[PDB]
Design a protein around this ligand. Structure first.
Ligand code: A3T
Ligand code: A3T
Ligand code: MG
Ligand code: MG
Lengths: 136, 136
């Protein structure tokens, strides 16, 4: 699993056209104030252990940043060892579930399988943009 | 070299604190309309050939998208095999130079070695977010 942690002043997205033949989530849009936006690329061989490490780290980082909102944003582009779409969707659902057991704020998982437009205003402090790798 | 191609409606950045002991570029800020924003991570063993392939591909993609502005945005976070900072800065300068021989529009290379704030509004079409790897 490869993640990018963007500490944002604001974030929004809208699904546009499907990017998979049959997207497993309905279309949607959402907008947020201050949030940790987590661009999430699920990799081949990510299992439940990987999900658990990611969730713990996101919760830990969120606490450090004093953010009360995390956006789990599926992203195909952080890796060249992607898990297949249905495995990826499952791992992202697990990640959302795991994060809720560790982090007490708003957890929003953006829909999987869509092309999206988005806007972000990313903060400029030294911890505002970090990357993470998890595996098992 | 690992790149992320974001086709933006708008983009802006401001340097905040230095992220290297001695940043090789002066601080600054800039804002843009429609642009191809190229998040650029220089990797160990990127040489002139790698730069040349990247430049050709950026020019090719830009032409396809009909964009007339490219932002070369140094980014430490797309890879876990980074080139050292001074090699990275040199390769980014070369990339800017090479792109100008292949692409006729505005080429802006953002300063290297700074923490930055930024905002982007990214388009939602199927070619609006792509990743690329180049090597030699
Ligand atoms: C395109 C861009 O605007 C958008 N934001 C996008 O990237 N959409 C991706 C993810 O939602 C998802 N997806 C497929 N495989 C994966 C994976 N292995 N890991 C995470 N997501 C995946 O399926 C879509 C097409 O790859
Ligand atoms: C931090 C975030 O807000 C900002 N946008 C940032 O990432 N700053 C990076 C790049 O400008 C640059 N840098 C260092 N090594 C590299 C490299 N190998 N490839 C590209 N840039 C590098 O040095 C800064 C600190 O790593
Ligand atoms: Mg890790
Ligand atoms: Mg390539």
């Amino acid at each position: 699993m490869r993640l990018l942690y963007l500490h944002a002043d604001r974030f929004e997205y809208k699904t546009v056209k499907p990017a998979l033949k049959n997207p497993p989530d309905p279309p949607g849009e959402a907008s947020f104030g201050e949030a940790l936006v987590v661009f999430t690329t699920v990799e081949d061989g990510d299992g439940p252990q990987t999900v658990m490490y990611a969730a713990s780290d996101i919760a830990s980082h969120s606490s450090r940043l004093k953010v009360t909102t995390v956006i789990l944003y599926p992203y195909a582009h952080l890796s060249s060892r992607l898990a297949k779409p249905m495995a990826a969707h499952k791992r992202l659902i697990e990640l959302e579930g795991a994060l809720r057991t560790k982090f007490p704020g708003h957890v929003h998982r953006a829909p999987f399988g869509w092309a999206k437009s988005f806007s972000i205003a990313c903060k400029g402090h030294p911890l505002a943009e970090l990357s993470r790798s998890f595996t098992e």
